[PDB]
């Protein structure tokens, strides 16, 4: 995260770290949506241009964390993966359309002060809150600048951007399964996700029921925190039917 700040303890208890077993390293963020399901970006698991195609046994998820590098004894919980599910129409060839994956854990995780699931949006919450100018929150352990790494989880609040501005910022084909967020050059304030943050959550706190909802998944950007560029997020609500089908079947 660029131009963010240190998270408070327990500020994002749904935040998950995707961790490679060997070599041991951070791969991506992710989020806890129930005691046995974790949501991330499909490109964190499958990206053939980079020879990336992880299997369950290659990976662990670490839940309840604050420090990036420490083993947080008696606080974090480490879970093995039972099964990975990637959206069948994830478009890794062109633009990361439908950049979403689910990971089922081998055993349920126990909730705690540090471990608690985020809500997924219903149609009405999405329609009400996914409006230009409305801010969400992005969290992660990724790099602090494009060209460096944080001691603890970072957090930044960013406004959703008007769809024409998102489209006019890039040559990539933008789809209805994406939204973009970030400040404009004239707004002064700054901030963005960066390498290592992808797959983590873009959340909003509903003013109707005072619950946190995951509206986006950190998906892609061109650089980090560049003027006139914006970060792109998977539109979680638009893909809810697939999420539900997976959880119902499996």
């Amino acid at each position: 995260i660029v131009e963010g700040s240190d998270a408070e303890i327990g500020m994002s208890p749904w935040q998950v770290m995707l961790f490679r077993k060997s070599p041991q390293e951070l791969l991506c963020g992710a989020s806890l949506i129930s005691d046995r399901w974790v949501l991330t970006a499909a490109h964190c698991l499958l990206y053939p241009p980079w020879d990336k195609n992880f299997t369950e046994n290659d990976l662990l998820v670490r839940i309840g964390k604050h420090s990036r590098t420490r083993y947080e004894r008696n606080i974090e919980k480490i879970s093995m993966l039972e099964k990975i599910y990637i959206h069948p129409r994830y478009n890794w060839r062109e633009n990361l359309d439908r950049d979403i994956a689910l990971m089922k854990l081998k055993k349920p995780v126990a909730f705690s002060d540090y471990i608690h699931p985020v809500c997924l949006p219903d149609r009405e919450t999405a329609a009400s809150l996914l409006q230009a100018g409305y801010k969400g929150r992005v969290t992660g352990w990724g790099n602090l600048k494009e060209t460096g790494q944080p001691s603890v989880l970072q957090v930044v609040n960013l406004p959703i951007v008007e769809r024409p501005v998102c489209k006019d910022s890039t040559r990539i084909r933008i789809t209805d399964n994406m939204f973009c967020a970030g400040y404009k050059p004239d707004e002064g304030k700054r901030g963005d996700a960066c390498e290592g943050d992808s797959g983590g959550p873009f959340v909003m706190k509903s003013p109707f029921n005072n619950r946190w909802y995951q509206m986006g998944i950190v998906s892609w950007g061109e650089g980090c925190d560049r003027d006139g560029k914006y970060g792109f997020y998977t539109h979680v609500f638009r893909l809810k039917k697939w999420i539900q089908k997976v959880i119902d079947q499996f």
Binding site: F19, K21, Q24, E25, M80
Partner: peptide, 10 residues
């Protein structure tokens, strides 16, 4: 860079 995790998880 990362602190070793317990062997039980590997």
């Amino acid at each position: 860079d990362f602190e070793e995790i317990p062997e039980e998880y590997l």
